[PDB]
Structure formats: structure tokens, C-alpha cells
Design a protein around this ligand. Structure first.
Ligand SMILES: [Mg+2]
Ligand SMILES: [Mg+2]
Ligand SMILES: [Mg+2]
Ligand SMILES: [Mg+2]
Ligand SMILES: [Mg+2]
Ligand SMILES: [Mg+2]
Ligand SMILES: [Mg+2]
Ligand SMILES: [Mg+2]
Ligand SMILES: [Mg+2]
Ligand SMILES: [Mg+2]
Ligand SMILES: [Mg+2]
Lengths: 109, 47, 215, 119, 122
RNA sequence: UUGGCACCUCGAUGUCGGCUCAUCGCAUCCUGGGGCUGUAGUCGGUCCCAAGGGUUGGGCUGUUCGCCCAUUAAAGCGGUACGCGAGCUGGGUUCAGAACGUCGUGAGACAGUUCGGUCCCUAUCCGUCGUGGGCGUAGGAAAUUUGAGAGGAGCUGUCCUUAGUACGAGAGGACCGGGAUGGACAUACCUCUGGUGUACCAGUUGUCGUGCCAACGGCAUAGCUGGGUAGCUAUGUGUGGACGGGAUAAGUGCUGAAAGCAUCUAAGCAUGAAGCCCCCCUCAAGAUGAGAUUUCCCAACUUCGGUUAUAAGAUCCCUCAAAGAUGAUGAGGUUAAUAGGUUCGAGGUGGAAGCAUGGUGACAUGUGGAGCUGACGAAUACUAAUCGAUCGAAGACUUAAU
């Protein structure tokens, strides 16, 4: 544990029911945004690269190619702005973190 | 990087005045007839 | 106003409203029972001095300073509380109220009262030129033997001195500093801590007095 | 974490100091070795209190492969010593917590010699 | 960041293919940049045809720098290519068919003719 | 600046540019305040008071200077041995080599070019930036403090509201008050983003060794690559520049004679600036003019010669660290949680070894999110902080209020 009293303030804001997984999975993260006359909600496919630093300050990130460009997006996973996480496919990787995706056909299986 | 002046017989003795040595602890053993140094153990003491 | 005397324990993040993440320093504010106060009638400045975390009883064989002494015994018997470790003036506020011997509270504030913070620095030992003050180093190649020292200090012999206030290598030092206009995102009562916004000086298990702002 | 000289030595010297602690049971040395060798040979003989094969391999990470013995006119290979004559001796709760006792300085230097004792 | 003399694979359909930034225009002594600022820059490569020609100083908005940007919730958008869009000095591009998915942050700075003319915007 | 004179220096006063670091004038470049305009408004010219703060990145040449590109609110002029080589480069100038033009019949010459050319020093005293011991402060000690003084900080743009209104036909387009976020700079701090992380974890290469296979050490920059906790940091996260007062400078004013009118002035009364002082933060009673409040301790020898020998309170000495060059600052010393260990946990790594199954194998899969863990958190006296010593007050006189 961190202390006896960090989490005593902080466990009351930690978020429940986010299906725990591991780097190598393939995610479809929805997220609510606002723009003008909309509270529209947007999907975002991708592959988890890394997952880090547990507690209320825990963090993961995902990577998706978009049109030839590798968009990499990062979230603090307990935010109340993420809506729903699926797990499209399990993964078989050896390394924990996966920084070596600067290639063009990785295909983690 | 040289002296410009020989230092006289006042600033020789006034400079070295914080250059001494103090006595150490010197607590005696109960049955040594010999003074150990504090928080130590001698070779031929009551320590 | 209501100068509490908490100590830090660390720093975390707390998700505010709609999406906003704001970093938070958590300040453990233990018991604070007010000792004697001093006014303009006695000798001339209206102030409330406040204690902080207590220690054990008095006068056996004071190896440490977690035991009291005959000075701080009678100085703390006057308010009939346990002897203290940190006593600080507050000539900011309220000569009228705050009866002597009163625990203050933790909830004098609300989630939105802006505050200030006074605490000591880290202190990073004896460090040199381009790390203490914002000076820039020399060239690291093309032959120069001037990497990291400070440059010239003064002019030639129409000023045969070096002017004091010269910013030379000395100790980095822990001296006091006050950030201004931090705010409180959340107050706890039961676990007896508060929170602030951003980050305050003074490394963990330190000391920091906070008070109202002066905006 | 204190030091001696450099990173290659500070493992291979310091592991070759607990070996001489094992076959002699008291040695004298200076401070910053003996303040620091306290917390390696004592952490090592938690592996005495487990004493299984998975702990046998990790005891070969530290001790020498060396220092045959002759106390019973026969060869105990100094890995078979600590699992029969040290782990059997100790069953107190904090492993094999050893004592130190300080002495005076030395002649040509000013380091305080200190007998450690495996008790 | 993108600073004094970077080199940028531009994203427009307007003849340039690589530009280099002389100045990051903004305040005095401005050094760095990120998505939504405007840099002045002179082309080096040139597609045969197009609009602009090699050696013509043009002004141009920044899009998708390599380091991320911290939007105010805790997210980050790290791309994988420095890029650019040549503007008409009325906050609209030259050509029509800009490639290369664009960050959402350039909306408060009224660049909204780029966003509607673009593929997938995040 | 270019000179004139030869007064100091030849028993050596190192010489141009540039980097490092500033400090000072105002004949002001921006910003603040006004007069006057042949000032419609927005812009602009010219002049007065004003040093508080700001004053940019590149190409060219050794350059100074200069022209040129893109910006900015502006790219000010100068002094400080044409500031700064016991702080730095050496590109030129002023060393030996060689060559070209040229002058000299010749050796050689040139403020004409041209390529290559050794930059020495361990700080005595002042001056600095920090940091401790003795003594003073009419009894000793602890804690908190007042603040004479002294430092620090002072900069600005762009967008929107008033409004497309006043002026001006039309082109365009505010003064004055409010609302937003940017730039540069000065701080504080690692939760996030990254970097480092040399007793952590995993893969693999040669070769040697543990009698051999499996396992595992040694050495090869840490043998090499992927990652990584604490601590330290920026390109990362927050905060900052005040609001408000008092007298004025330029200027504008009211009342008003000298000098029956006018007239800002002579006596009075206004108003008026990023400027001065108080306000903001930091230090500061060695401020010998040594301040202030609360709390604790008070004796025998003895012609006070105080001989002493102690209290309060420290310290010597030890285990370390939120501190740290040593000393100093803090946390502790058995009635103990100060370190180390033991146990549990966070974080990190990524599924140990054996054993079994399958494959002729190379190796796959279960047992099992395993094993293994340096700095961070909690619990526990298991080892070590033992027994001792050293220093340390017993309160003068004067007159005054009683
Ligand atoms: Mg002259
Ligand atoms: Mg003459
Ligand atoms: Mg002579
Ligand atoms: Mg001479
Ligand atoms: Mg010379
Ligand atoms: Mg003037
Ligand atoms: Mg100035
Ligand atoms: Mg070039
Ligand atoms: Mg001739
Ligand atoms: Mg072999
Ligand atoms: Mg206990």
C-alpha cells in the first residue's frame, strides 16, 4: 500500500468495474466529449502499448494507425470521461512494455 | 599565486589557534584497572 | 485566518468536475490547541500563537527532544494541554475570538477558500554556479577550457573591488518561501487532513503553516 | 548503501568476505565493511531457515564455490556447512542476526577495527 | 516541439512536400511550437506541377507535432510525424484534399475550414 | 572618434574581435504622463517631465562597422584600462617556413595579398558568496517574536464586449471603463509527460570455471540491447508581477493684489504619472542605542578569597537523515521503534527451478500473474544505541515612586 491515509482520501473516487487486462490486448475505448450542440461519444480502436503505476494515478495508453500515421493516445484509466472498454482479442507477448512498435507490420499474435 | 608578504609572528600564531586536539571519552571499566575508550572493548580489560 | 499548521505526506491527483484533473498535495493537519495569545495591552502586537503535534511527558533524562522540559512544561500548562513541538505566531487574524486552550478545527475553510502557504525549501547542499542561479555554461568543445565556472566578476582598476551581491557558488540552502493564492479542492474532517492545489515547498514529513490569502 | 571502491569489486570482494565469515565465525575489519557485511550474510541465512533446493541454487549466487573445511578431519564444502551447522543452531525469529563490537584504531591508519561475531 | 530549422512532411495537395521553418512567429524571442500556432517557412522539395514553387516563403499552420499535447482532462495525443498545412493568410488552406489525421485542438483558433476539409479528426 | 603634447610605466602595466558575467549615466528605442499641430477618426510629425523594467533569432567577413531575410511592444546612444585572458578560446595583428605582384644590379623589403604557426601559476592580504567556535547583552536557560535597517519583485502583446456606433459623404474607425487567455522572465515541486537510474528484474554472445548434463558464477566500456522503484531534475505540473493609499515633476486649475483690468501665485486651496515612500515576499536586536512576552532554578564554606560543587539547561560519546565539504541542522539512546534484520504490502520486472505431458529434436504447455526484488509504507525488540564524564547561576552603585 502507499500509506495509511493517501487512499483514505482517495479510495472514494477510485473507479470500479473496468475489466482488468494486460498489454497485448486490443481495445475499443469509447469516450464522451463535447463540441457545440453535442455531447457526442466516440469509439477509438487500438492496441495497448503499456500500463503503469497503480493507484488513483494509474495510466495506460493505446496505439492505432489511422491513415498511415500511428496515433498514440493516453488516458488516466480512472477518469469519469471513459465510458466503456471492450476486449476484442487476447494477446501473446513476452515483454511487458511494448515500445518496439516503430515497425510497419507488427501483428502481435 | 605567490605570497606578497611574509606573515609576521602574529598572524602565524593567531591563525593556528583553531588547530588543536581534544581528549576522547575515557570511561573506566569496572574491573580492568584500565581505561577503555567509550563504546569500545579493549583486549585486557573488564571489557 | 485560522492558521492551521499541517505537515505534508505526499502528492496525488484528484479528478475534479467534468473532465478536469488537478494535482493535489495532501496536508496532514493534526491537533492544534492554541497556547497563550498576546495583544496590544501587554506589549504591542495582536497575535495568536498555535501549537502542533505533541510529545511525551517531562523531565526524566532528556536525551532527545521528544521529551519536554521545565520551560515548555509551564508554558504549556497555562493552556492545560500536552507540551508541543512547533509553535508559530499568527498576527494575521482575530484578536477578539479564539479562546485560549481551544482546539481550532480542521473545517475552518470551505472547498474553495483560497489560501497561502509558508514552508522551508528542500535545500540541496553546497552547489555551484549554473545550478544555483540561472547562469548558462560555456562551450563544451572547440577547445574551450571554460565549461562550467562563473565568468568575470568585476571590471578593471577603475573599480578595484567586486560589488557585493554577486551570485557566486555557495550553499543552495533551505530558506523559507511563500507561494500565493493556492486553493483547496477538498476538506476532510474524519481522517483529519485537507488538500490543496498544485504543490507546496518542504519535503515529506516536513512543516508548513497555511493561512488565508491577501489578494 | 555504503561503498568501498568500485562496482566490480564491491560485489566480488564483499561476497568473498562472508565466505571467510562462515568458516571462521568471527573476523575483524574496518567499519564500512562491517556495518555493511552485517546486512548480506544475515540476509543470506534466511536461506538456511528454508533450506530447499530452490534456495540451494540462490545460495550459490553469493558464496564462493570454494573453501573446503577440515573441522571433523573431513571435507565440508562450505555450502554444506551452513545448512547443517548454522540453520540448525538458529531458530530465533529474526533470521541469524549477528552482533558487532567495536575496538580502537589501528597503527598506520585511523580506522576503527571491529570484531563481528556470528551470534 | 518544433523550432528553428525543423523539416516537415507537409500534408497538403499543393505542391510542397517538405518545408523548413525559419521562424515560429508569436511573441518576442519565441522558440518552440506545438499544434495550433503559425510558422513562416520556405519550401525545399517541390512536386512537379502544384501551386507553390521552390524557394517561396509562405506562412503555414502547424498540425500534429511529434511530441504530444496535454488537453485539460489528462489525455495525450502523440502522433508519429511532424506535419504542416500551408495557409492562404485567411486561415484557410490552398488546395482541398489534406491528408493525415488532424488534432482537434486547432478549433478555438478558428481553423475550421481545415477540419471540415479533412479525414478523421481527433 | 581622428589627432596635438611626452607628464607616469621599458629591472615587461599582455594587444583587436567573440563567448561567460554584469554594473552605471540619459542627450530616450518601447511602455507611462502632458503641450502643440497645416491633428475628421485610426495613424503620424515635434517638444517637455520621466531610468522602474524590457531591448530578437540567422546569412556574409577575423571582424568593429555595414547591407540583407523573418519577426517583435521596441530591435537606443554611450562609460566602465575602446569594461572583463592570475575566467576562456586565438580566427587576425606583431615570431622563424614558402609563394605571387612589385621596388632594389644585391642581401632583402610591403598599414599589399596568400597557406602553416607552444597562450605559464597549488591564493598569502584586502573584496566577495556561504558557513562555524570565544566573548559580550549586570543572575543562568529555553521557546516565540517586534523590526530601526538591508536585500528581492516591478516587463508586456493578441482576441472579445461597449459598436460597427462619434467624427468623416465614402474609405475606414475609437478615446474612456469591463472580459478572456498568450509571450519572455523569476520562483516552488515530481502526481501526471519524458530523461537518468553501476548491489533490481529478463534475453543473448564468445571463452574459462564449479568432476559431467541440466543449472550458475568470473571477464570482456556495466560485454550488449528492451524496460524500471526511490533520489535528482525540464522540455513537465502549479503559482507569481498586485489592488489600495501620501507628496510631487511636466502640465492643467480655482480664488488674488502687486500693477483698480486681466493674471495658476506673492500668502492660501486643488488635481496630476510604470517614477519616490507605506503596502507584497526574503533576511535582520553584534541595531554594543545589544529590544519584547511567557515559562523554569535559587546554598555552605565564610573577613564574598568565594573557596566550591551542583540545579535548570546543555554537551562529550554513540545508531542515521527530511540535513550535509567537516563543523552546523533535525530525528533517537532501553520507560526505546533510531537504524539493520524478520514479516506483510505498494511499485517494478513478465510466468523461476524442479516435476509431469507432447515433440526424434530445436523447444512448446500446466503446476502458478508465478518466482525475484536498492533506496518508499506498516508491524515486531531479534542485534547495536551500555555503564560514565565535562561545562554550567547564587544577582554592584546612584538618586527617583513606594
Ligand atoms: Mg586622446
Ligand atoms: Mg619638456
Ligand atoms: Mg633601471
Ligand atoms: Mg618591476
Ligand atoms: Mg607577456
Ligand atoms: Mg530628460
Ligand atoms: Mg536600465
Ligand atoms: Mg551554410
Ligand atoms: Mg629586378
Ligand atoms: Mg567445462
Ligand atoms: Mg511497541
Amino acid at each position: 500500500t502507499n500509506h495509511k491515509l493517501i487512499e483514505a482520501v482517495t479510495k472514494s473516487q477510485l473507479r470500479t468495474d473496468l475489466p482488468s487486462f494486460r498489454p497485448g490486448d486490443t481495445l475499443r475505448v469509447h469516450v464522451r466529449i463535447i463540441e457545440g450542440t453535442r455531447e457526442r461519444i466516440q469509439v477509438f480502436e487500438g492496441v495497448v502499448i503499456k500500463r503503469r503505476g497503480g493507484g488513483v494515478s494509474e495510466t495506460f495508453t493505446v496505439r492505432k494507425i489511422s491513415s498511415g500515421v500511428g496515433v498514440e493516445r493516453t488516458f488516466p484509466l480512472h477518469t469519469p470521461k471513459i465510458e466503456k472498454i471492450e476486449v476484442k482479442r487476447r494477446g501473446k507477448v513476452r515483454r511487458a512494455k511494448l515500445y518496439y512498435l516503430r515497425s510497419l507490420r507488427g501483428k502481435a499474435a | 599565486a605567490v605570497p606578497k608578504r611574509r606573515t609576521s609572528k602574529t598572524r602565524k600564531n593567531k591563525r593556528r589557534t583553531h588547530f588543536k586536539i581534544s581528549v576522547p571519552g575515557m570511561t573506566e571499566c569496572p574491573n580492568c584497572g584500565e581505561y577503555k575508550l567509550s563504546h569500545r572493548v579493549c583486549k585486557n580489560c573488564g571489557s | 485566518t485560522k492558521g492551521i499548521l499541517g505537515r505534508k505526506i505526499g502528492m496525488t491527483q484528484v479528478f475534479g468536475e467534468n473532465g478536469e484533473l488537478i494535482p493535489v498535495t495532501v496536508v496532514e493537519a493534526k491537533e492544534n490547541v492554541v497556547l497563550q495569545k498576546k495583544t496590544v495591552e501587554v506589549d504591542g502586537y495582536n497575535a495568536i500563537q498555535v501549537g502542533f503535534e505533541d510529545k511525551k511527558a517531562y523531565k526524566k533524562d532528556a536525551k532527545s527532544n521528544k521529551y519536554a522540559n521545565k520551560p515548555a512544561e509551564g508554558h504549556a500548562k497555562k493552556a492545560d494541554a500536552a507540551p508541543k513541538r512547533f509553535i508559530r505566531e499568527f498576527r494575521n487574524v482575530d484578536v477578539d475570538a479564539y479562546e485560549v486552550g481551544q482546539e481550532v478545527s480542521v473545517d475552518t475553510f470551505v472547498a474553495g477558500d483560497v489560501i497561502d502557504v509558508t514552508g522551508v525549501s528542500k535545500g540541496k547542499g553546497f552547489q555551484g554556479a549554473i545550478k544555483r542561479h540561472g547562469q548558462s555554461r560555456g562551450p563544451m568543445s572547440h577547445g574551450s577550457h571554460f565549461h562550467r565556472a562563473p565568468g568575470s566578476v568585476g571590471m578593471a582598476s577603475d573599480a578595484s573591488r567586486v560589488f557585493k551581491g554577486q551570485k557566486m557558488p555557495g550553499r543552495m540552502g533551505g530558506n523559507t518561501v511563500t507561494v500565493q493564492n493556492l486553493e483547496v479542492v477538498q476538506v476532510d474532517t474524519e481522517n483529519k487532513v485537507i488538500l490543496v492545489k498544485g504543490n507546496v515547498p518542504g519535503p515529506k514529513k516536513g512543516l508548513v503553516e497555511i493561512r488565508t490569502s491577501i489578494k | 548503501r555504503k561503498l568501498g571502491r568500485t562496482s566490480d569489486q564491491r560485489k566480488a570482494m564483499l561476497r568473498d568476505l562472508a565466505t571467510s565469515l562462515i568458516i571462521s565465525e568471527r573476523i575483524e575489519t574496518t567499519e564500512a565493511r562491517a556495518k555493511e557485511v552485517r546486512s548480506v550474510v544475515e540476509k543470506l541465512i534466511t536461506l538456511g531457515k528454508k533450506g530447499d533446493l530452490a534456495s540451494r541454487r540462490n545460495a550459490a549466487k553469493t558464496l564462493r564455490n570454494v573453501e573446503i573445511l577440515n573441522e571433523d578431519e573431513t571435507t565440508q564444502t562450505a555450502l554444506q556447512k551452513l545448512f547443517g551447522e548454522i540453520a540448525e543452531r538458529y531458530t530465533e525469529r529474526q533470521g541469524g542476526y549477528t552482533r558487532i563490537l567495536k575496538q580502537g584504531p589501528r597503527r598506520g591508519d585511523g580506522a576503527e577495527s571491529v570484531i563481528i561475531e556470528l551470534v | 516541439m518544433i523550432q528553428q530549422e525543423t523539416r516537415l512532411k507537409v500534408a497538403d495537395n499543393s505542391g510542397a512536400r517538405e518545408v523548413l521553418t525559419i521562424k515560429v512567429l508569436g511573441g518576442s524571442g519565441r522558440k518552440t511550437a506545438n499544434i495550433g500556432d503559425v510558422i513562416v517557412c520556405t519550401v525545399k522539395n517541390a512536386t512537379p506541377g502544384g501551386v507553390v514553387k521552390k524557394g517561396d516563403v509562405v506562412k503555414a499552420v502547424i498540425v500534429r507535432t511529434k511530441s504530444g499535447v496535454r488537453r485539460n482532462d489528462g489525455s495525450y495525443i502523440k502522433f508519429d510525424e511532424n506535419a504542416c498545412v500551408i495557409i492562404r493568410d485567411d486561415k484557410g488552406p490552398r488546395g482541398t484534399r489534406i491528408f493525415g489525421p488532424v488534432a482537434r485542438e486547432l478549433r478555438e483558433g478558428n481553423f475550421m475550414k481545415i477540419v471540415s476539409l479533412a479525414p478523421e479528426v481527433l
